[model samples]
Target chain A: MQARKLAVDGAIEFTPRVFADDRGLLILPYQEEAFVEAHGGPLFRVAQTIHSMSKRGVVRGIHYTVTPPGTAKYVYCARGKAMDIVIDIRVGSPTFGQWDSVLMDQQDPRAVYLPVGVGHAFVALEDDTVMSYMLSRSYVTQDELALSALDPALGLPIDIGVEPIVSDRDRVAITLAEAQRQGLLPDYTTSQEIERRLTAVP
Target chain B: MQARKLAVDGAIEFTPRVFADDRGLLILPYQEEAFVEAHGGPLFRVAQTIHSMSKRGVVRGIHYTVTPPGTAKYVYCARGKAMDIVIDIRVGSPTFGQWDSVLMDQQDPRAVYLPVGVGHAFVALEDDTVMSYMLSRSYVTQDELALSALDPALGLPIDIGVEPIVSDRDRVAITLAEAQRQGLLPDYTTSQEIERRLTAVP
Candidate 1:
């Protein structure tokens, strides 16, 4: 496998070797040894796979896990096309409130690495676009929080030509401003406290 | 940092701790020792950074490097919102043609790891979105090749609104079919040979 690091401090991308012949093709998307050599680590305690089926303009998330049991993810676009996104919600994060994106489609078979205290979301560019993920934590209903994808403060441009097909739960999700008002949002001070605790323990 | 592996194989994510206080906030996004513990090794020989500025609706890439000198990338969303993506472009790869995406936004402050032979691209959700990269190889213009992000045969969602603004070079990029016709794409067989070379010397 070959790997590269992005401008953000710890993010990475991976592409595994592929073999082909007259019959068809075979691909090994992930390999442990290669991974270790490139980035330097083992797997987290938990893993997950998320499959999404949505039409173009369908916006989902701006979701994240609260710290303490913060979440990290490794994501890929399995079939069709979607745009995977990352937002720095950790209040103390140096890059807080900054965002970036990666375009996922059939042509580039690549995987994305996401760290804890970050928000993740995606937009389906076509119908039946499928995305899969590996997570560091299992599902915790209360711990999972959602931010409005269309929050004017966030300025995320989710252009769903028509009304977005959103789940009722998501529709009622808090806006960034509201989350802050409720004290549900992470603060730099609290983030630092969590960091100190994490380091102290390990 | 908290790290984990993906089911797609060879993919991983890392989240570092953040410490904040009444004075201010402190963030440790990357640390060598922590990385070594998670990934079990030292940094590879090369580290790279890629910078791109795109207008809304502009799509670039589905690009990969030839192995032996195969490239790996660690990606981060530096400015504006973008979708960081990966594709299993390694022909014959077990995960051949499979794709994944991660949202890189300010609120998440996360990064991605992309191994060699995987194709990479991003769509600018808004104007002047910049994606920064840390690469495993030095920049060699000739070694880079572009695959059509708009190839219908690949069934990519290239036309998803926003009037894709493509580079002159990218706009004329060869379609996947054309790349196949010219034997320009990488596959598993070639990847193994390259991997052997990489390990043989290291």
Candidate 2:
């Protein structure tokens, strides 16, 4: 396995070896030693997976986990076509308020890395598009939070070609401004402090 | 910092500490010791502060370096919102064709970890979305290969709501089908052989 860092500190991308023949193709998505050698350290304590399904013009998220328990994610598109995205919502983060995206489909077979305290979301451009994830945290309903994907300030490019099929929960999700007004957004300084504690952990 | 594993055997996600206060926020996106402790071992070498920029709807990748010269990446969405994604594209890979995604935004200040041989790409939903990276390998033009983001077989999310804005090079890039036809795609078995050599390096 080989690895590289993305723009955000600590985020990474990896490509593993692929073996193929007339029988079909074989892929090894992860290898412990290869990962340790490339990026450093042992495997994480927790593991998770999220499966999502959507149709063309279906926009979801601009969502994130609250700090104190900030979450990190590894993502990919399992079926059909979709665009997965990440946003920096940590109030005082150096890269706060910025965003980035990775395109997932059958052809590329790539995965994305997201650090803690960031927002995540995706837009399915096709029917039955499925997005999957490997998360550092287990689902804690209280810890999960959502921001308005339609929030104009975020400037997310939710394709207007078709009416977005949004869930009622997501439809009423707070906007960045609203989240901030309610003092629900993460504090960059506080989140950083939490991170410092994390690094300091043995 | 917090870390977690993916459904895939060895894939993981990590989020470092960020310190915030009235004076502004302080962040240590990467720290060798912290990474080593959480993940294990020391890095083969560390690469930081790499940057790439893309325009809205411009699909840039589905690319990876051949192993031996195997590479790994640590990524962050530095300036804009992006969907960071990963796929199990390695032939012989246990998780072949599996995928996941993470939202990379400025507000969360998180990072994603990727192992080797998986393919990666990001669509700039907004113009001038800048993706930054830290890589285990230095850039080598010859080791790099691209798979078409527009390949129907891959069924990427490009050409959805907006007409994709691609570079001249990417515009004519080979699709996965063509890459397979031309045998341009890397071989997983060859990668394993390469990995064995890399492990012997130190």
Candidate 3:
């Protein structure tokens, strides 16, 4: 396994050694040693593991959790293909408006680690693309927040090969600027503190 | 989340609370609370996570690991539909020849926990059906072993809604009774010991 720092501050992309045979293949998407070496700590004791299946050209987010109980995520493409994007949505951070994308597919499977408070979105390039995630916190309806994936200022690559299909919530989500103006983005320092506290838990 | 024990001893089927909205659905397929309540112990700390995609009519496994590094698995369908089967292949187990199946798909997703030394198999009922797994041990090709999914004596439900598509490795694998006669099956007591030792590691 190996890791590469992404454009977004504190975000990373990890590639694992895949083993294949006449039977099938195997991969260790989240090996502790590699993750600790890259992030300088263990992954947050996972609170929830989620799997979502998307059709071709489905755009999922630009989503973040409200701070205090902000969530961190480790995501990967389980099947098919996708372009996963991470945006620095943490307020008062050096890379606040920057973003980076990782190509996730079976051919060269890689995983992305998003620190607490960063915005996450993905464009499914093929039908039945499944994105699997391990989150630091469980879902709380009110605390989950979203920014428009199609926000012109951000210009996410939602229109890949097929027409972009978005959820009603995401389609009507507020833009990043609009969210910040409304004082909805999480604080950088607070997010860092929470991440440290969570991962440090035995 | 809730769990129900299968016919095979120590095997469990987990049903999670699936939360849904226009933004799609979320499920924590392997919740610690429900798992502990059912198994009386925590899940074995995951060492490797695997995802496999299959076309309709694909049949994988009736697979097991060689003892001394026996693997425990938590498996679920990440996309499409399938039937997950667990067989007690541990020599001297009270339920030695017993087998049970779980229906897994997007609509009513359920996860199965296979304790160390059991046999596992699944039949993909849809194209691009993906199976996700968290295993207690890393994959070692030499330590992995397979039993014929189409063994006449076992009578597994491989031909469900589609003609069975099997791998060359599995198709040529030995039958359960043959494996036992050859002294290749894991000892029930040894398997239980390994499970306790693995899951108890802090």
Candidate 4:
């Protein structure tokens, strides 16, 4: 397995070795030894495992778990393809306001690790593309949050080519700048602190 | 907030009394005191928070977590409406194969508490309907599982009113009976035991 850092400070992309033979193939999306060496521990203790199937052009997220009890995630595409993207929405940190994307699909599949307090969004490249994730925190409505995926200042690659489908919430979610102004975005320092604390417990 | 059990065994619905004034409104989606008193234990510590937006006719899930490391969920509608349903997919359970639905919407907004080893699915009733969840366990890809929502024997409410929109996976997923026959469903005894174990840790 190979672990590489994404553009964002706390983000990482993992690509595992594929062992193929006459009988299809074998691959481990995440390796314990490699993960411990790179992430300094095992993956965040499983909280809630989630699976969502989306049609082509269905864009979901730019969503975040509110920070008082934030979330960290590990995601991969199970059946189809997606442009899984992450944004460092936390304010008051070096990489604050930055973003990155990983191409995930069944063939030569890849996984991305998103630290707590960041924003996650994905565009389904094909109908029935399923995105599955391992999360660090259980969800709470009051603690769930969102930021506009179409923010001009952030200029996410969501619209790189396709018209990009979106829900009313994502379409009208406030911009990062506006979220920060309203104290909606988390503080980067606080997010890392929380991440470290969770790591220690694990 | 009031806690009430739904038709499905181990499934619950929480309704918070809304307080509205000339200016606005005041409501607490969750209150620990009430939760512990009603649930006999505090709510699971926040693990991974999730939010999903679906358009009318979109039918997502019929999904569950793999046992031994299972998941329990408290879900609500953040916007619009949906028919949230659950199935006692646990093999050897008294209610196995039985199903029930809860109408969730802003007007009478309520949350559903799904115990470990059950199946959950919802049909979006309006455009831009949002579903949010609070989870007890973090996600592990290998520990995530699913069954067919369209199984005629299960007779889900999915197609009762209108043509249901389904993903390729759900459309082709096996029936609960088929899953049970294949030894894919979690054992009822094992599921309860696992829940107690996790609850103890929490």
True contacts kept of 4: 0.00
Q: Any runs in candidate 4 off by more than 4 Å, and if so which?
A: A21-23, B1-200
Q: Which candidate has the highest DockQ of all? A: 3
Candidate No. with top TM-score = 3
Query: Residue B155 lDDT in model 3?
Result: 87
lDDT of 2 by residue, B93-200 (tens): 676555556666556655665666666766766654546555566667788777666666656555547776665666677766566567655556665554343223
Q: Write the per-residue lDDT of candidate 3 for residues A48-86, one digit (tens) a residue.
A: 678777778789997899997899998999878999999
lDDT of 4 by residue, B165-198 (tens): 7766767878888888898888788888776665
Model 3, B15-95: lDDT tens digits are 988876543556788776677778877777665677777788889988999997799999998877998999999998999
lDDT of 2 by residue, A25-74 (tens): 33334444554564455233223434455667778787778777876666
Residue range B41-134, candidate 1, lDDT tens digits: 4333333334444566667688788765787666655446777667667767787766666666544545666666678877767665655554
Q: Candidate 1 - CAPRI tier? A: incorrect
Residue B185's lDDT in candidate 3:
91
- The ten-residue window of minimal lDDT in model 3 chain B covers B18-27
TM-score-based ranking? 3, 4, 2, 1
Per-model C-alpha lDDT, please?
0.60, 0.60, 0.85, 0.74
| DockQ score of the complex predicted as candidate 2 | 0.02
As a TM-score, model 2 comes out at 0.47
Worst 10 residues of 1 chain A by lDDT: A20-29
Regions of candidate 1 where Cα sits further than 4 Å from its true position: A1-9, A15-19, A33-39, A160-162, A187-202, B1-202
DockQ score of the complex predicted as candidate 3: 0.33
